Every structure is written in C-alpha cells, then in structure tokens.
Amino acid sequence: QTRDALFTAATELFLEHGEGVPITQICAAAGAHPNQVTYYYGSKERLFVEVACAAVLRAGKRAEDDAATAETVGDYTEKLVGSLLGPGAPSVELFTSAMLMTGRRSELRDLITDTLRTLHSSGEVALIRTLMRTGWQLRAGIDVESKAFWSAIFGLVIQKTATGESFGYSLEEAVAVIFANLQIPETVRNT
Amino acid sequence: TRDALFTAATELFLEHGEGVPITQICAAAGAHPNQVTYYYGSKERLFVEVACAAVLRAGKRAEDDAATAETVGDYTEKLVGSLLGPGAPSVELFTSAMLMTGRRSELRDLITDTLRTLHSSGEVALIRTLMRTGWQLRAGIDVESKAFWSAIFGLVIQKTASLEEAVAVIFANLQIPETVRNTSI
C-alpha cells in the first residue's frame, strides 16, 4: 500500500538515476514518511536490491511475453533479445549494479542469487526450449546454455551503456552477438 | 608521486570499491588531498583510470598464464581461469567503472579506449591460438571477441554473488568442436 507506493517511486527513480537517488526524494515521490522505508525494507540498500531484482525479472518476462507473440522462431529470438537489449536494458543494468554492490551481506546476496537462478530457469524453459523443440542442437546441457545466454545479455548491456551504444556495441551489434552465440540454422529460424 | 596515489588507490579500490574516501587513499600514499585534484581532476577520474589499468593488467596476466597451454582447450581454461580467478577483482572493478561513466566524455573515452584494447588483443589472441588447427570461427573475428568479453564481464559479475561452467559458456558461444579443443597449439 505505502509498501507499493515506495516500490513504484523507487523503481522509477532508480531506473533513471541509479542507486544515489536520496531516500527523501523516493519518500517525497511516494507520499511516504522516511520511517516507512525502514519499516518495509530495513534499509535503502535493501529497497534498491529488491527493486533491481523485480525490474530484471519483469524485464525478462516482458521479453519472453513479447517473443511468444509470434512465430517465427528467428523472430521470437529477435523479439526476445531486442526487448532485453532495448527497452529492458535499464532494468538489466540496474540488476548488474545491484550484483556489484552486494559483497557479502547474506540478506541481500540471497535476493540476488534467487533472482539469478530464476532468470536462468526461465531461460531453459522459454528460449532454449523454444529452440530445442524447433530443431536446434544443444552444444552444452540446457542449464549451461541458459547461463551463456544470460551472461552475454549482462555483458552486452553493460558495455552498450558504457560506450553510449557505439564502439561495436550499438543495439544492432549487441543483438548480432547473441545471434552469433546461438548460431541458429536458417531452417529453424524460419519455423 | 602521482604513482603513490595510483598505487594506494588501486589496492583500496580493488579491495573496497569506489566508496573508499579519498583521504584514506591520501593517507595510504602520504599525499595531500590537493594532489588528487592536481593529477586527476576528480576522484572518479582516478577511479576510472585505476580500473582501466587493472583490467589491462588482468588481461596481460591471463595471456601470460595461458601462453604455456598445450592445446586450444587448455589455453581457454587457463585464460578464463585467470580472468575469473586472480584477475576477477580487477575485472569487477572495471565493470563498476563502466556503470558509473555518467555520460562524461572524459570518463567514457577512457572506458572505450580500454575496451578497444581488450577486444583488439582478443581478436589477435583468438586467431593466434587457432592458427595450427585449420578450424575457422563461425562468425567474424570482431564479433567473436565481443562474445568473449561480454561473456567474461557477465560471468565475473555473477560470481561476485564455477570455472568449468564458465569455460563451457565460452566453448558454446564460440561452437568450438571437441577435437579443436584437443588440438595442440
């Protein structure tokens, strides 16, 4: 309720400006008292990590969702990768910032690790299954193929944002690296 | 003694990340806080400079560590083993530096120069590794170098919260056949 008001304001402000957004500005945005932050989240860092985790989960589902809408397979893949690298990029990028700032606070590491396992499960059952059932051959076990897909996504988002989408990491170029990683036969793509 | 600063900042950054206070760096190096504005202009520019140097140092260490490999797959294990092992802190710092550029040209230009170095050296190591084998990479050498580094940055960041898995990732993304992996170098 105020929980939700905080979460939304936090989400918008963090996605735009990163972890340095003062709490008072989130609270001003939410119509919340700074006390509700400590009540609902225990700390700013914990709000930030939860926001970052929900953002990337929601980004991954949006990509999978937008990909399910249509055949073809080449097109499912373009849609899925194009979503994560384009409109979902600030969410992936926040979650990368979150993974970097959680050294050893176990609270907080557990949110990260749970989020990572879910992204990786999600990739086995959406992308990698979409490929296998339409003809594509695993090069490694399905778990590893999901992780190869996700760590590419993380590294492409990071370098794309740092380079300002150039020096080899424009949107088109980053999409093409995922295509080269998957090397999906033309016949499979046309399904 | 820019270098006292650079040295102290590199150890403290590597260990604790960008939040290390600049006085703490100045106390480790016996410099005065003025010296940082002098030689670097900002703490962030010093941070970015240190992280850029650290990751280059890590890549050179990785190539050193892999230079005695006997086979392509041996080579890859040592290369990756090094970036995700001894070099992981330096890679993690450079990945932090990439996320904080804040659109500042002085900072982006350091990052992009450094990425270009890594990637060009990656193209060169890739082709030099595979020379003997008569096996040809599946996509363009430039695309392969990006796929290597994107994997590496994306893996190192996770470990932060398995080398066998990491090597298998590189193997898959590149589709290097088993017999190529076993081919001598």
Side-chain angles (χ1 to χ4, degrees):
Chain A
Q1 121 248 197
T2 327
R3 163 164 251 287
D4 300 330
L6 277 174
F7 205 86
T8 296
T11 300
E12 202 189 353
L13 281 161
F14 287 152
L15 281 169
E16 185 168 7
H17 300 292
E19 205 223 304
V21 173
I23 208 52
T24 55
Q25 217 175 95
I26 287 158
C27 290
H33 187 283
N35 286 327
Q36 309 189 268
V37 180
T38 79
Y39 196 49
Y40 292 116
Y41 304 97
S43 77
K44 199 189 155 174
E45 288 70 48
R46 176 160 249 272
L47 184 54
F48 184 73
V49 174
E50 282 188 24
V51 161
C53 291
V56 77
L57 286 179
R58 290 202 163 92
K61 190 197 193 281
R62 167 66 43 209
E64 294 178 343
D65 270 347
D66 292 10
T69 91
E71 295 259 327
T72 99
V73 160
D75 221 289
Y76 170 102
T77 315
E78 273 160 56
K79 264 160 193 307
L80 197 162
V81 178
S83 192
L84 293 174
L85 297 179
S91 294
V92 179
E93 171 189 346
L94 196 60
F95 176 59
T96 71
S97 295
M99 288 189 269
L100 289 169
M101 52 70 90
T102 67
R104 9 225 156 80
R105 283 147 253 79
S106 87
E107 318 148 58
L108 215 55
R109 195 224 197 240
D110 294 350
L111 254 23
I112 289 303
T113 60
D114 278 351
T115 301
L116 279 180
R117 279 175 173 289
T118 299
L119 293 177
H120 291 153
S121 291
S122 83
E124 296 171 12
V125 306
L127 189 70
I128 305 302
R129 193 178 184 191
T130 296
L131 298 187
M132 290 162 77
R133 72 163 163 92
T134 67
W136 179 91
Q137 298 304 277
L138 258 14
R139 289 82 56 102
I142 190 177
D143 55 314
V144 168
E145 296 275 3
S146 193
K147 292 171 174 199
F149 175 80
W150 275 104
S151 52
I153 295 288
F154 299 146
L156 297 155
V157 169
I158 289 159
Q159 287 178 105
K160 172 151 75 53
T161 199
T163 51
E165 294 136 346
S166 181
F167 307 86
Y169 287 97
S170 66
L171 171 61
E172 190 155 23
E173 286 168 296
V175 170
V177 160
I178 297 294
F179 287 98
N181 288 168
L182 294 171
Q183 213 56 258
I184 300 178
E186 208 191 330
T187 54
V188 185
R189 301 201 297 277
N190 297 315
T191 324
Chain B
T1 216
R2 248 189 349 206
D3 296 16
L5 288 171
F6 207 79
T7 312
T10 137
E11 345 186 332
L12 287 161
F13 295 143
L14 279 164
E15 186 166 24
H16 302 290
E18 77 177 288
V20 180
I22 216 25
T23 54
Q24 171 141 45
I25 296 178
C26 286
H32 190 278
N34 275 47
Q35 313 264 62
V36 178
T37 301
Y38 197 70
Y39 298 112
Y40 304 103
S42 65
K43 174 190 193 184
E44 289 79 27
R45 161 108 190 193
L46 169 63
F47 181 78
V48 180
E49 287 184 29
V50 347
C52 287
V55 81
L56 293 182
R57 198 149 74 234
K60 172 85 158 62
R61 180 70 179 291
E63 290 194 295
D64 280 357
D65 303 348
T68 55
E70 323 201 285
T71 58
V72 171
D74 186 18
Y75 176 86
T76 306
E77 283 167 23
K78 296 201 183 334
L79 191 80
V80 171
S82 189
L83 293 164
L84 276 49
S90 303
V91 171
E92 185 183 334
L93 201 58
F94 176 70
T95 73
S96 292
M98 279 195 283
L99 292 169
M100 52 70 87
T101 75
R103 264 238 153 226
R104 293 179 283 279
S105 285
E106 25 132 16
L107 281 36
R108 174 170 301 170
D109 285 344
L110 296 173
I111 294 283
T112 68
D113 291 349
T114 304
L115 286 177
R116 198 187 302 98
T117 295
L118 287 174
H119 282 75
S120 294
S121 312
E123 282 168 40
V124 175
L126 258 159
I127 291 310
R128 289 182 184 175
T129 297
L130 291 177
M131 280 270 227
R132 236 52 130 169
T133 79
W135 190 75
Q136 219 208 304
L137 285 162
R138 307 298 129 215
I141 194 52
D142 57 309
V143 173
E144 295 290 20
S145 189
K146 288 176 204 169
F148 172 79
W149 287 107
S150 303
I152 293 300
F153 295 133
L155 281 163
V156 161
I157 72 172
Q158 297 182 52
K159 322 270 152 283
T160 303
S162 174
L163 283 55
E164 204 159 301
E165 228 136 78
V167 178
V169 166
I170 301 298
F171 292 146
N173 288 348
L174 284 70
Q175 305 90 43
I176 301 151
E178 184 61 14
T179 65
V180 184
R181 306 176 201 174
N182 292 127
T183 315
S184 296
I185 239 180

